[PDB]
Amino acid sequence: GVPTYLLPGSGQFLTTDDHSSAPVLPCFNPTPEMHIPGQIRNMLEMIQVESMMEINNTDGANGMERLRVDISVQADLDQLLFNIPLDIQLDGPLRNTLVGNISRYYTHWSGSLEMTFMFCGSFMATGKLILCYTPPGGSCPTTRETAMLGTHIVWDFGLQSSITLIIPWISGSHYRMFNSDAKSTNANVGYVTCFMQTNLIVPSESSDTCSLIGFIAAKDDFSLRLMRDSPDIGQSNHLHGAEAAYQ
Amino acid sequence: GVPTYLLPGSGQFLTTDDHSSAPVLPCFNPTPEMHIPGQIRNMLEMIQVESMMEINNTDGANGMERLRVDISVQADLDQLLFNIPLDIQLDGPLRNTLVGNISRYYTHWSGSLEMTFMFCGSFMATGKLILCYTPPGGSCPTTRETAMLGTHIVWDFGLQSSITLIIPWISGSHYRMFNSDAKSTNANVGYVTCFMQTNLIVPSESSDTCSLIGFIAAKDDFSLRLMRDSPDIGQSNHLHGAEAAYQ
Amino acid sequence: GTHIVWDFGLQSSITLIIPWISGSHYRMFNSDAKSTNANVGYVTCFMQT
Amino acid sequence: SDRVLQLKLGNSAIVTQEAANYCCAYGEWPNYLPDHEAVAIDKPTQPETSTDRFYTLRSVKWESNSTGWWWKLPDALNNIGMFGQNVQYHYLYRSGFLIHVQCNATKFHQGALLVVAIPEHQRGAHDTTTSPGFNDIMKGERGGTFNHPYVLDDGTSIACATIFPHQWINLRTNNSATIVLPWMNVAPMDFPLRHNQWTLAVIPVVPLGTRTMSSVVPITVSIAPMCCEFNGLRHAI
Amino acid sequence: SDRVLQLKLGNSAIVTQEAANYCCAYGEWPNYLPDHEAVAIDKPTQPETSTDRFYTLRSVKWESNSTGWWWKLPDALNNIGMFGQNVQYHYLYRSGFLIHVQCNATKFHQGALLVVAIPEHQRGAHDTTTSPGFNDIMKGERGGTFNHPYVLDDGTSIACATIFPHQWINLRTNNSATIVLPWMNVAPMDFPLRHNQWTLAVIPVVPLGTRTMSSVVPITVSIAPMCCEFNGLRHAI
Amino acid sequence: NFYKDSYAASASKQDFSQDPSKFTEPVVEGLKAGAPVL
Amino acid sequence: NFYKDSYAASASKQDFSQDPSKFTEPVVEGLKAGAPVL
Amino acid sequence: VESIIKTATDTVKSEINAELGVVPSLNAVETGATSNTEPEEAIQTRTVINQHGVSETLVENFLGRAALVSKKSFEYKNHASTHKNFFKWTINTKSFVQLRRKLELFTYLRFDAEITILTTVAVNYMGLPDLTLQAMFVPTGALTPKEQDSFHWQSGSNASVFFKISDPPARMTIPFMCINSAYSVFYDGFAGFEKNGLYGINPADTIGNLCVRIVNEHQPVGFTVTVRVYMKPKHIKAWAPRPPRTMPYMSIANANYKGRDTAPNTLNAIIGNRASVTTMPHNIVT
Amino acid sequence: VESIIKTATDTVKSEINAELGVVPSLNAVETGATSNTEPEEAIQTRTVINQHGVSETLVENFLGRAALVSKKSFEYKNHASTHKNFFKWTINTKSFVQLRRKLELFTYLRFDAEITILTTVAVNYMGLPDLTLQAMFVPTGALTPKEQDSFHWQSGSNASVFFKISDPPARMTIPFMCINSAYSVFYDGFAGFEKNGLYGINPADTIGNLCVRIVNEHQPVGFTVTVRVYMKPKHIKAWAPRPPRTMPYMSIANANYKGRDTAPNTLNAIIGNRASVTTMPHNIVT
Numbered sequence A, B: 001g002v003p004t005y006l007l008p009g010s011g012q013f014l015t016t017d018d019h020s021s022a023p024v025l026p027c028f029n030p031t032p033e034m035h036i037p038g039q040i041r042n043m044l045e046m047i048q049v050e051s052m053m054e055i056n057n058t059d060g061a062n063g064m065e066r067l068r069v070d071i072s073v074q075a076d077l078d079q080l081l082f083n084i085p086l087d088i089q090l091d092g093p094l095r096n097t098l099v100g101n102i103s104r105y106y107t108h109w110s111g112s113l114e115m116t117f118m119f120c121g122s123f124m125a126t127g128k129l130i131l132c133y134t135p136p137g138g139s140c141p142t143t144r145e146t147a148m149l150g151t152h153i154v155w156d157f158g159l160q161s162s163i164t165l166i167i168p169w170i171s172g173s174h175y176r177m178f179n180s181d182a183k184s185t186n187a188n189v190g191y192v193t194c195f196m197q198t199n200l201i202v203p204s205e206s207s208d209t210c211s212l213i214g215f216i217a218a219k220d221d222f223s224l225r226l227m228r229d230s231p232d233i234g235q236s237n238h239l240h241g242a243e244a245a246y247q
Numbered sequence C: 001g002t003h004i005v006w007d008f009g010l011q012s013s014i015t016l017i018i019p020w021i022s023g024s025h026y027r028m029f030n031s032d033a034k035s036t037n038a039n040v041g042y043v044t045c046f047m048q049t
Numbered sequence D, E: 001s002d003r004v005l006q007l008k009l010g011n012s013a014i015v016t017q018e019a020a021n022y023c024c025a026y027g028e029w030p031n032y033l034p035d036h037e038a039v040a041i042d043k044p045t046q047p048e049t050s051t052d053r054f055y056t057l058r059s060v061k062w063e064s065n066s067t068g069w070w071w072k073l074p075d076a077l078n079n080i081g082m083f084g085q086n087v088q089y090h091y092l093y094r095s096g097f098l099i100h101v102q103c104n105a106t107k108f109h110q111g112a113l114l115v116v117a118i119p120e121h122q123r124g125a126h127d128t129t130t131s132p133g134f135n136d137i138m139k140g141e142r143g144g145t146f147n148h149p150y151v152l153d154d155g156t157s158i159a160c161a162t163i164f165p166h167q168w169i170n171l172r173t174n175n176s177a178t179i180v181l182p183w184m185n186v187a188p189m190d191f192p193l194r195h196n197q198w199t200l201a202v203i204p205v206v207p208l209g210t211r212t213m214s215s216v217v218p219i220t221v222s223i224a225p226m227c228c229e230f231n232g233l234r235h236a237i
Numbered sequence F, G: 001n002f003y004k005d006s007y008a009a010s011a012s013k014q015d016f017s018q019d020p021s022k023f024t025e026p027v028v029e030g031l032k033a034g035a036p037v038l
Numbered sequence H, I: 001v002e003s004i005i006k007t008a009t010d011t012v013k014s015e016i017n018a019e020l021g022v023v024p025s026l027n028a029v030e031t032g033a034t035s036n037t038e039p040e041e042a043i044q045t046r047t048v049i050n051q052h053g054v055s056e057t058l059v060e061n062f063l064g065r066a067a068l069v070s071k072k073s074f075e076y077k078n079h080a081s082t083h084k085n086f087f088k089w090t091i092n093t094k095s096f097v098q099l100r101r102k103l104e105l106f107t108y109l110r111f112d113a114e115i116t117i118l119t120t121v122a123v124n125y126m127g128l129p130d131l132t133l134q135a136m137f138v139p140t141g142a143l144t145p146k147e148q149d150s151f152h153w154q155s156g157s158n159a160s161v162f163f164k165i166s167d168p169p170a171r172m173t174i175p176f177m178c179i180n181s182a183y184s185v186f187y188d189g190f191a192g193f194e195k196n197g198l199y200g201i202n203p204a205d206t207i208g209n210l211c212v213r214i215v216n217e218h219q220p221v222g223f224t225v226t227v228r229v230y231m232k233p234k235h236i237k238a239w240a241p242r243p244p245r246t247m248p249y250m251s252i253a254n255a256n257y258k259g260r261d262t263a264p265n266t267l268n269a270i271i272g273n274r275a276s277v278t279t280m281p282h283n284i285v286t
């Protein structure tokens, strides 16, 4: 026979191993394949679709009210309207999104993100907003004069209803990672803030409080690494009916 | 199937074995390589850099005072200034050097060593010294007339501040080894002694006591064999914080 | 500002170049030392060591 | 240019002067079942114009506190016109769908409706371990309403529902949404009375609002089956 | 020939008539970040002359009982000139450094200074398990001093410190040391306010001594950033 | 794969084909860069 | 290596390239044998 | 539109833009298309040759992991006077939430399933017996054994695997066996021709029954035996991604939801609350 | 300058030298360069064809050894009334001094890590149980199990390895997983944007968490189980060698030092003392 010797690791069951194994049903002929719409081959395809950010995650905001940010006609100038924490790996407005959910099945990420906002006021309503992305380093800006110094887009409401703020990949390291410390130098992405560039202006018969819906998605320069179990689901007991599967 | 049989050694875990093993994270894409200054590929590259010998390893000499040898204007002739034990595998002036530290991770060695001394007196100070390497066999020479019979270099202080004494590889066997017996025929390298060739001479305003800094390094004809744990580090208890890694 | 660190030695002299740095092609005299078309700036000397 | 559109199928046609391009689910287009994917061997009937035409369902009223509406396919049309007759007389059916949702208002009105076509939208019941019943699912032409649109009545989320074929009707922008749906199933054909391939969901993410004269603002759904095929002829169920 | 040298960058220049050749750390030379190693995608700013020039720090006095001095980079320059401004306004920075240490005395003076550039010089604290604090590490332009130069304040040894890029200033031989440092890091760029790539250490291995007129003998450090690049523009921190 | 049934083989991690547009841009008329969408 | 990921392979003990001079002689101007260094 | 992607896309340097009629940052969410604004059009970019791989997110790898799908403990003893030295498990992938949520990120899935069976024992001390177990695959609603020693275990046609506790976990692959071209992860329909059937349960998607018994007759003392079954899908094809599950699961038979008592993941609020829309959580306080 | 070296350099015979202007034995340490004086220039040499190999000092071999990085003993029993049949270990290479000192001879290191897990047991006598253990890799600061039987062990995505005490030690390779091009053995910085962070600890250099549990339920008696983890780096690239550690280590979190009470390796004196600089230790007394 062939002389052999067993190596360390012999007999172990590694859940991520990759080997062939005995076919239970020999000569079984699987059902022929049929074309089906919507085939996905890489999860990166899924996170490139923009989904709604839960920006209004505040007490008093229930259900869908949390998915839209209301802006009103201001009495003062250069007003701060809202900000958005940026760690797609932590709980916040970005967590329950396509990019956020899938990214949380991983530990490392790299790539540009894109935030698109759709103005949902009436046609007669006008306005200009400024959306700013502030790379990490300091405290979140609270004035337009400060936020304006970062990456930004000035948005003019009009026929094209939506604006896109690109959050370019700006990092020292190739990848950023999750480690449960939001202030870590390898985790913090910076901030996104929104101020009135001019003001929301509407006539008497238009609602004077309008909503914006913010969406986010990854661009195709995105990459995810190091699979891990998602923190977004868990169980303490058997699900109802689980034990009945044994009866 | 294939007929086989297990050989002695089967199932063992040899810390120096060399085999492939199951990848924990399948399809993982490591961060791209980037050029980084100072890559080292063979430890022999490191021991070729000269480092400071602790020649003044005496009671009363503290910290950096141990890294320099002071010489003074002599009243007598042919004065012995200092000597240096040569086993780079035992505790002494050569142990805490680049060549000494790395060599002590091994058991066998072969090759020429080089000792370079830099005179650090004032510019107005002059002098001639003789550095001698005495191959093994007898007692360390205590007079210049005796040391002078071995390998040596007569050093004249001047613009070029440093002199090099080559300790050529002179051994009966291909390699020398450590076995904790400094007087073993396969370990003892011989001796290095330094005498005044003339004298240190300085004017009234120059310090009349000057320091030399001795360095040592291996040449590129060096070779190290038989890896072993270094005797230069050890622990009796858990390090502080080690157990906290489990909490 | 523009400078040169001078080390005393065999070559006994050092040269500090005061390059022509002006907004206008020429500077002029008009008896007002603080005029924008007259003031050249300053030269200072400190111990380096 | 991409704001005006005319859809014509059979003896029916629809135009909109305030569209937003239109969606082809997963970039596909309806087609008849090819021989290399067929299973049922009887010659199918392909009614064409009598079934592949627009069927307009009863409208619903968009109110300030509405939670949303849904219509399951083919259930919503299983009792309408010749499409309904073919469905009742045949054990098997297959088809795509051209969906057109309509809602106009005023330049002083605001509101945003998510119009999404969900494949296999298996509903969940709220706060109970008992699975939804037949009457909770099969609403027919009337359709149903969302109890908790925030989680799409299935424990997931409307926030990520954009992963499905969709459009929006944002009043200041457009007054209609159009989605073309190809046959979507793991089998080449199916029994129309017990399984719904798609669910059309219309949900007001941004509520209807205005300060001008208050008027009833309806939402209307018109659906045209496409490339209908039926097999397994027998009596009407 | 290898004893005289002139360094010129931007609007600054330095000459020495008593040099000892000069060191290029690991035989490398500074350079701008190539496209095939870049990570941050925004167009970087390359200030050139406004930042790539010599900055002279406050001098220190070499005394008979001195233990040594150190300056961390870029910390030491993070608040000096336009280099400091770019650092404060940008999240990311990258650069090499040209270091020139100066110390002259008399032909009757003796002393030897080890001038070494240590990559990632992570300091250790003495006789305690508590890690060094922010203020123990970030000294800025003033730099710090060694507590136990014998072990490089990190439990290792100055004896083997020659494994790092270095030169010596041996009073009877030369009056200056010059070391060129390339970008040294595991990432192409970094956040300048929380990480120091290099630490310049000047340690008197052989103490200052003489029997002539006693005078204050200073040690001066001049540092010129090289090939500076900054990314991630925002407000000043 | 030493087994006679192909379905017994090890994993197939070599399909790098992608078409995000079926999810990101399922619009009948392609949208040109820079040009107004509507 | 029978594993699909290259990082799972056995050790690579075949890189005999060296350049001691980056540590031993990092001087800008090369030093010639026998000639006075300064 | 389709193409081969092995690394994240590169970035091209871009210049200043001031062109009338060209507004790349403006989009129309109403069309249903995701914004196509490129980084190069939003800001001035540099050139970047991106070498980041995209293989760890391949569907085959994302779902290609052996996940726990069944865990059953029973008493191995003389049951003279409950699982009497054997049990029957109707296979399903809805009992353990980690695997379930991932599979439910898709509408349809086609894959072969590698099954691994791990067994552990504990005395109810004189040592642990190296028992032999038998795992028999019994098709949908098919005839299962009713006793540890019934004739049914003769397994004339059913596939059975006999393994020892001292051996590595047993393993075998069940082929993609659906009567359709793919399994329905979700099923908006009723499995029967009558109206009283179960909703959302397509029988075609139930791999089958797993009957496991200890072959050895009982010992003089009792033991607790636990059998864990793991499943790893391979040769995977997936269609129509879906919104991820947010509310805790309630049952293996449906998508019923209730939500946590308090955010996060409460029916009323999925994301945890912050003081206001201008309050920055984890703000850097330098 | 770069070249392929497979053996120590040969020696060439040399003659008498008496040349003006040529002084090979003189050097200038101030330049920072190491002496370039060759043996042939210092003395008269003979020709020697040196065949001594240099492969045992290759970095791959120098660091290529499985070294102990973790040792944990815990009680396996009914913990009704401490590591309750499982433990969690934040991976680090700073706890055992032999491996630590060697890794710290370098500034940066890039390598894949072969992990080997050895398990031993002792009764607190009726024999030793052949238990099954589970080692689950849980990423940085990620969610770890809190009970021997929590749902977290279902390991839907995390990699888990199940092994028996009777099997050879478990083994697997963790790839070079740093977010950077190499691990930072030393880090002169703070891991956070605020000023209160930990100094010298770059999170990017922490491979992760290792959660190990005994899968079997407790037995009627208690046992002491010890798990030892070994790590062997391979496919190694190293940069910027450093001064070796001399003072005993004090903590795994920093380079703090104190020194031995008396030489050798005391803060005041690394090398042991000799009577004087003219005293030859171990002098041959013939």
Ligand SMILES: CC(=O)N[C@@H]1[C@@H](O)[C@H](O[C@@H]2O[C@H](CO[C@]3(C(=O)O)C[C@H](O)[C@@H](NC(C)=O)[C@H]([C@H](O)[C@H](O)CO)O3)[C@H](O)[C@H](O)[C@H]2O)[C@@H](CO)O[C@H]1O
Binding pocket: A090, A091, A092, A180, A181, A231, A232, A233, A234, H260, H263, H264, H265, H271, H272, H273
């Ligand atoms: C662990 C840590 O570093 N900090 C803790 C704070 O984060 C925590 O405050 C709460 O944190 C919550 C985090 O959100 C998730 C998460 O872990 O990412 C969201 C998950 O979807 C959710 N999973 C499930 C199945 O519901 C998960 C889970 O609820 C928790 O792990 C259970 O505790 O939470 C969230 O933002 C909360 O709104 C926030 O208050 C504080 C609480 O005292 O403790 C810190 O140690």
Ligand SMILES: CC(=O)N[C@@H]1[C@@H](O)[C@H](O[C@@H]2O[C@H](CO[C@]3(C(=O)O)C[C@H](O)[C@@H](NC(C)=O)[C@H]([C@H](O)[C@H](O)CO)O3)[C@H](O)[C@H](O)[C@H]2O)[C@@H](CO)O[C@H]1O
Binding pocket: B090, B091, B092, B180, B181, B231, B232, B233, B234, I260, I263, I264, I265, I271, I272, I273
């Ligand atoms: C064992 C033998 O053959 N002779 C013993 C003498 O050597 C010993 O005298 C002392 O020897 C010491 C040796 O230096 C080291 C070494 O082992 O090489 C230097 C190491 O770096 C050090 N390691 C650590 C972690 O500190 C190591 C260690 O301290 C000792 O092994 C612990 O005892 O010592 C050194 O030269 C001393 O200065 C010298 O006095 C005598 C002492 O009675 O015993 C002999 O058996």
